[PDB]
Design a protein around this ligand. Sequence first.
Ligand SMILES: O=P(O)(O)O[C@@H]1[C@H](O)[C@H](O)[C@@H](OP(=O)(O)O)[C@H](OP(=O)(O)O)[C@H]1O
Ligand SMILES: O=P(O)(O)O[C@@H]1[C@H](O)[C@H](O)[C@@H](OP(=O)(O)O)[C@H](OP(=O)(O)O)[C@H]1O
Lengths: 271, 271
Amino acid sequence: MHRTYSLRNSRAPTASQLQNPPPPPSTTKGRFFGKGGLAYSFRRSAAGAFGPELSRKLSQLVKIEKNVLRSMELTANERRDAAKQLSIWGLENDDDVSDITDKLGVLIYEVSELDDQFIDRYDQYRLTLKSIRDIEGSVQPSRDRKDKITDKIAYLKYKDPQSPKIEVLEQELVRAEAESLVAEAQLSNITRSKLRAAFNYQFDSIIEHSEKIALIAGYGKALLELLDDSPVTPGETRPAYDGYEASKQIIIDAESALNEWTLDSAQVKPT
Amino acid sequence: MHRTYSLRNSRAPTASQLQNPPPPPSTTKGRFFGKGGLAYSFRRSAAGAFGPELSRKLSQLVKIEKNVLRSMELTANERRDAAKQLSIWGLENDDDVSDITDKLGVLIYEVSELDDQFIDRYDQYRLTLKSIRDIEGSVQPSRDRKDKITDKIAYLKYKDPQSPKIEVLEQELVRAEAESLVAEAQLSNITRSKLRAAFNYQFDSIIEHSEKIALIAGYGKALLELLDDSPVTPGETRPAYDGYEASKQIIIDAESALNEWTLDSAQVKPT
Ligand SMILES: O=P(O)(O)O[C@@H]1[C@H](O)[C@H](O)[C@@H](OP(=O)(O)O)[C@H](OP(=O)(O)O)[C@H]1O
Ligand SMILES: O=P(O)(O)O[C@@H]1[C@H](O)[C@H](O)[C@@H](OP(=O)(O)O)[C@H](OP(=O)(O)O)[C@H]1O
């Protein structure tokens, strides 16, 4: 988060924000529950009511992550349709305009397919989170039994300190305690391992997607440079278009670079 | 698109796809209309029925782009909630685990706010597309009148070649034609200018967002390195955690780098 020490819900402008004023807030921000509907909210609340207490939060996280994946795939499909129909509109235009919008449509198609691949990786990470949820929520009943048996032992001791069940219940409490402390140890180990692996995978997918999208954007801007933005004076003829070969090579190079990209090929250097 | 010349709906694996097998397709791909509901589809169809013919496609593009923006803001809010509640789950864990998941939550919060900024830029680009739609759809009725008047002139000439209305209608046809050819010229000019500017803005926002997300991912992986993934043997104690200062400096550096990022500071070099 970028907030400086102030009560303001506004952050100090960065270098990009200093370069130009930020655009006004989106006009599509309507008034609603802030999420669109209620069925997924009911699912989330059910995850927050019925599940075991100590696993309830992680089950809710898994459900919300599934919602995020659903929304991401839906918006990827919608972006694909938008690119297709944008190029459809650009078909009946100037030949230069038609070619430029067609190539932009292909680039957005690549962006959509890369989004789909990142979505598959994101679902793999979500499955890992589901696995850690499962193991930890199945290790919870050990401590549940420990708490129940210690409460029963306290109640029996208060009611009848000389009851014969005291010794056997004490052995059982010891046994659940040996079952439980070291189970906590194993749970911590597996939680650390699974969390580290899943988040490393997720961040590798994130950086790969970001770098591929950045390369696509750079190639698209270089190809936009090809577009002739010089206006033609009223009443004049249309100059001939000869950018087929240049955009031809540009899209060829974009595909070649996308094939060539590797995890080590990432040029992002954190400091 | 990455498809090689084959009937396969499968693309040759890239270097990243060669490094490891791709994950299986997402398990959340349910059976439905492929989009979730019907109200937005009705809106899109109304955009594809009632509007002027030559502006109908661009109006549909604007509507679909609004749908994309709505979905993007919804998924950004859901990702924000997911990060918050993930860190909420990580609160009651190991102190190292609590700190690492808290910092990851902050990083995903930054990702969400950057998504919101990119969404604002994307809506600015959508507004530019709306503007070009408006001007071009308002220039369409000139050609509509030209076609109507030429049809009327042909019908009148066939019905009565010596009708007195022939000369005045011919002058009006000339006048609409002088109104229309050069209007086509101006429309081509304004379309080129608006499209180039809007797509340059969109691609600049895209590359900025991608680079910021890539820096966030790199810093997050470097911070995940801080996590102690070494398992502890059963029955042993918990080693003391001392990573507060290291993650302290890591998040400080991440914020500093995010402030320092400029458009020229982008390190992506298309070839
Ligand atoms: O004032 P009203 O009667 O409620 O209608 C609004 C506005 O006048 C436009 O018709 C429309 O924007 P466009 O001109 O771009 O179609 C907008 O839709 P929007 O919010 O989805 O943009 C409507 O909400
Ligand atoms: O086959 P169904 O009837 O569609 O139900 C699916 C599955 O059987 C589980 O109930 C659930 O996973 P869990 O066992 O972990 O709850 C999953 O949710 P998910 O995709 O969010 O994991 C559901 O989609």
